[PDB]
Amino acid sequence: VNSFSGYLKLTDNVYIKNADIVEEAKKVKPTVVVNAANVYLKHGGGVAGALNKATNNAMQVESDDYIATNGPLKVGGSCVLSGHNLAKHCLHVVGPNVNKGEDIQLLKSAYENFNQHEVLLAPLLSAGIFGADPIHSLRVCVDTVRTNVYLAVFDKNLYDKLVSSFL
Numbered sequence: 001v002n003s004f005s006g007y008l009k010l011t012d013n014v015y016i017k018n019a020d021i022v023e024e025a026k027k028v029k030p031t032v033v034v035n036a037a038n039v040y041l042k043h044g045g046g047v048a049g050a051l052n053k054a055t056n057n058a059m060q061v062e063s064d065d066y067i068a069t070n071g072p073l074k075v076g077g078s079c080v081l082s083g084h085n086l087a088k089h090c091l092h093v094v095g096p097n098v099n100k101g102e103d104i105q106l107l108k109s110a111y112e113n114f115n116q117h118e119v120l121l122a123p124l125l126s127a128g129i130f131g132a133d134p135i136h137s138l139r140v141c142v143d144t145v146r147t148n149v150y151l152a153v154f155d156k157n158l159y160d161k162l163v164s165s166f167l
């Protein structure tokens with residue numbers, strides 16, 4: 001039993017809700033919140049901009065030190081950093097950004113990072129400003145993640161389409 005509330009169950013391990021991931025994290029304080037990161041950990045917009053703003057830019061400060069030491073992530077890769085005031089940990093995961101021409105096949109690799117954590121609060125990878133089809137992203141999530149994932153979908157209209165179109 002965990003403290004996630006109001007989710008629709010899609011499969012044995014995937015749950016979904018129309019919610020703002022920032023507000024969900026502040027309420028639940030999950031062990032792991034997933035950020036929709038880029039390889040430079042430059043948290044400008046979308047989920048990343050929102051999570052960082054909620055940390056008063058502490059996420060960006062920590063991320064800049066991480067990059068200075070380690071260099072950029074790979075598309076499809078991840079790193080674990082602090083969750084600041086939102087969660088114990090933040091798993092920064094880089095899905096492919098279709099608006100950069102990146103290979104959508106890398107979306108499965110991106111979701112594989114979730115399997116290293118027993119329970120996660122997460123967005124749909126490569127959705128929103130990353131330019132991928134969210135229905136496809138949800139499909140890849142369900143077919144790749146085996147650990148317990150609680151998906152927050154910001155847009156109510158998209159959420160309803162995701163639920164009603166889910167196979």
Ligand SMILES: OC[C@H](C[C@H]1CCOC1)Nc1ncnc2[nH]ccc12
Nearest residue numbers: 021046047050123124127128154155
């Ligand atoms: O893939 C990133 C998704 C895409 C959007 C497009 C419409 O709904 C989902 N973004 C987010 N999902 C959940 N919480 C969020 N808070 C701020 C941004 C955000």
